[PDB]
Design a protein around this nucleic acid. Structure first.
Ligand code: 2UT
Ligand code: ZN
Ligand code: ZN
Lengths: 456, 222
DNA sequence: GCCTACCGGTTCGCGAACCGGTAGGC
DNA sequence: GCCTACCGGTTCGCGAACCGGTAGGC
């Protein structure tokens, strides 16, 4: 990391490191019962100590010049151990009673709609606002990159909570994980106590947070880099970083009428809170996504299905394709375990865009997902391994798009019929879900841009 | 936990928020707990007991609202209770309990300042260590646990976390650590404890123990 | 969270005094 | 042969000063 500007000597003297170990640590301590939720940043520029309650004006600091440079190590490692409990070097860290815990820090030639697409998916201040509702610390998280091993442990704590919640474990067991999580990921609750992770959807909410938070740091990783040479334009630099060939499907096109039909037709009768309006149609072609999908063009039963996600995620979805949840993450929220989920109705997928009356525009995908021999399920069931000969799973719903009006498209079955009753009604799903447990089975075809019309 | 706090001045150093003069040592003083601007933690705003009731604060029931009320001397509790404002068997057991509650309050207080007269802090520290007790930080708190130890008994370790239980207002709270991240939350009115063993070194133990002290358990408020 | 007045425990500094060696007087 | 006024040097006694660990304050 760099120098903390609270010292006032940020662009004057560099932060020091002895060969490998950088003399700079950002500690944290939370006790849900007491309500305390604090930070403690220590640095060696001069020694600098910062402290207070995370996400508020509560706190203070002390910049202090040393007599010498060897006295700095003496003052630093002493203050460190006094606060954290451990020595500066260690094989594995161990938390101590009421001591702190250290956090692991690390002229454009394109169409106007395509420029707006980059404008929409690379505005990171819009992604910052998106995190404000989650209560993630807004202050130093953009400059302070939280580690990958750290976030995996944060995922692991969430998965431990769901396990603890499922079989009604002790309050202390739950108290620990709730403490552990908020220490590991600094939250901003202001002057009130951190809430206990006791619900089934609270872990899911914090699981979704980590998923979104990850994609913002990924969006930064793309934006920060490349070769800054005076030749290409700023928007073109970010376009090439997406690693995809995007084209604008004209409204006069015959295939464009099919998508607008697929949007208009497959709107849910129950999801009457909003009304869609297709602003744009983009034909999308990822880098080497056809090379990996070649295997599954042999596979039968290929369907063109909807998939919606936050506008913040589309920065990463274009660059890395659609990804399955990590193995450390909790299985809560998922109906049939971790995998890529799809729907035949635009509305059901459109809810995952997370749009409001203030933020109207939203992005939704259409991918040629090779379903193949399907494993049909009625009720929710967390699966680990698929049955033999099955390449996908299907959640059977009440309403299904008319199978006798299934139009084809480039050798892909597009179910754009209106809703009728399904074959079986002993299910706990209202609409269909299509699940693939391999990132190779998906092949993204179209990206849409949708305006939502509410009534308020 | 509580908003307010009352105790005898642990030092004649802290000033009074209203009048801004030094609150003298061992004097009855009251506080109001506020959020410290300088660090993440509550801090007491100490007042002179006289000055506390002119700021406009009105504690309806001190015993349930103010912290450290039960630890005070019996006569001093009544001063707070009055100044805050400005059937046969039922009333008998009710009245006779308050008789036994005073009996227990000023029994410990007689024992407390008896040890303060005869013993130094190092004697009281080594008293607790001999009885396998955690030595607390603070002068007042040390003899508070020694007096608790002698009258009722040497507190045995906790069931799960193996820490030290401590009397706090209305119960014995465990102060140990169930884990490194979290504190233990064991609480009880009837804790486990063996008998208090004074070492041989006590030429005034016959005088202190001669103060009509028999076997009895901790009595709590209603 | 950090600052600092307070506590006990040891050291330090300096003048009184103790003391032995001595050389001028008778 | 004593006595004794004078001087250098060691010891002794006691209050000032020093100091590290900490309970209380904000
Ligand atoms: N979003 C959709 O297109 C969608 C459409 C219809 C049904 C579902 C969908 O999603 C479900 C669940 C779901 C959605 C997102 C999610 O994200 C997990 C994190 N990933 C986000 C994208 O990048 C990879 C990581 C997990 C479960 C569903 O049940
Ligand atoms: Zn006053
Ligand atoms: Zn315990």
């Amino acid at each position: 990391a760099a120098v903390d500007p609270d010292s006032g000597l940020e662009h004057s003297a560099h932060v020091l490191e002895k060969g490998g170990k950088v003399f700079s640590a950002t500690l944290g301590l939370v006790d849900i019962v007491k309500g305390t939720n604090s930070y403690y940043k220590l640095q060696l520029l001069w020694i600098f100590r910062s402290w207070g309650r995370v996400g508020t004006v509560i706190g203070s600091n002390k910049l202090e010049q040393m007599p010498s440079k060897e006295d700095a190590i003496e003052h630093f490692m002493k203050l460190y151990e006094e606060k954290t409990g451990n020595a500066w070097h260690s094989k594995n860290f161990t938390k101590y009673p009421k001591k702190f815990y250290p956090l692991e820090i690390d002229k454009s030639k394109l169409p106007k709609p395509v420029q707006d697409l980059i404008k929409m998916i690379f505005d990171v201040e819009s992604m910052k606002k998106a995190m404000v509702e989650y209560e993630i610390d807004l202050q130093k998280m953009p400059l302070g990159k939280l580690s990958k091993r750290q976030i995996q442990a944060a995922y692991s704590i969430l998965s431990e909570v769901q396990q603890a919640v499922s079989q009604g474990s002790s309050d202390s067991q739950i108290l620990d994980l709730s403490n552990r999580f908020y220490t590991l990921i600094p939250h901003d609750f202001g002057m009130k106590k951190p809430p206990l992770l006791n619900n089934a959807d609270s872990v899911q909410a914090k699981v979704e947070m980590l998923d979104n938070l990850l994609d913002i740091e990924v969006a930064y990783s793309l934006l920060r880099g490349g070769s800054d040479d005076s030749s290409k334009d700023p928007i073109d630099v970010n376009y090439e970083k997406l690693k995809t060939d995007i084209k604008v499907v004209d409204r006069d096109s015959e295939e464009a009428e099919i998508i607008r039909k697929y949007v208009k037709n497959t709107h849910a009768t129950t999801h009457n809170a909003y009304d869609l309006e297709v602003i744009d149609i983009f034909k999308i072609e990822r880098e080497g996504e056809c090379q990996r999908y070649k295997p599954f063009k042999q596979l039968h039963n290929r369907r063109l299905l909807w998939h919606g996600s936050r506008t913040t995620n589309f920065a990463g979805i274009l660059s890395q394709g659609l990804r399955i949840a990590p193995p450390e993450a909790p299985v809560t929220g998922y109906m049939f375990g971790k995998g890529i989920y799809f729907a035949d109705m635009v509305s059901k997928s459109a809810n995952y865009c997370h749009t409001s009356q203030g933020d109207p525009i939203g992005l939704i995908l259409l991918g040629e997902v090779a379903l193949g021999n399907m494993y049909e399920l009625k009720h929710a069931s967390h699966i680990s391994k698929l049955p033999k000969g099955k390449h996908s799973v299907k959640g059977l719903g009440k309403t299904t798009p008319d199978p006798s009006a299934n139009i084809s498209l480039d050798g892909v079955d597009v179910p754009l019929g209106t809703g009728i009753s399904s074959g079986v009604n002993d299910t706990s799903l209202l609409y269909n879900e299509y699940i693939v447990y391999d990132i190779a089975q998906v092949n993204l075809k179209y990206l849409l841009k949708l305006k939502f019309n509410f009534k308020t | 936990d509580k908003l307010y706090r009352v105790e005898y001045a642990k030092s004649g150093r802290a000033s009074c928020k209203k009048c801004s003069e030094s609150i003298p040592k061992d004097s009855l003083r009251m506080a109001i707990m506020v959020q410290s601007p300088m660090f993440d933690g509550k801090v007491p705003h100490w007042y002179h007991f006289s000055c506390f009731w002119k700021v406009g604060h009105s504690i309806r029931h001190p015993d349930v609202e103010v912290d450290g009320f039960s630890e005070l001397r019996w006569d001093d509790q009544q001063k707070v209770k009055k100044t805050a404002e400005a059937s046969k068997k039922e009333k008998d057991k009710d009245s006779k309990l308050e008789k036994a509650l005073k009996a227990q309050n000023d029994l410990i207080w007689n024992i407390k300042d008896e040890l303060k007269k005869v013993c130094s802090t190092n004697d009281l520290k080594e008293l607790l260590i001999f009885n396998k007790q955690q030595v607390p930080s603070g002068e007042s708190a040390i003899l508070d646990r020694v007096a608790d130890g002698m009258v009722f008994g040497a507190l045995l370790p906790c069931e799960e976390c193996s820490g030290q239980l401590v009397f706090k207002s209305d119960a014995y709270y465990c102060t140990g650590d169930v884990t490194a991240w979290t504190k233990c939350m064991v609480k009880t009115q009837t804790p486990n404890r063996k008998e208090w063993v004074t070492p041989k070194e006590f030429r005034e133990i016959s005088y202190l123990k001669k103060l009509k002290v028999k076997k009895q358990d901790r009595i709590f408020p209603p």
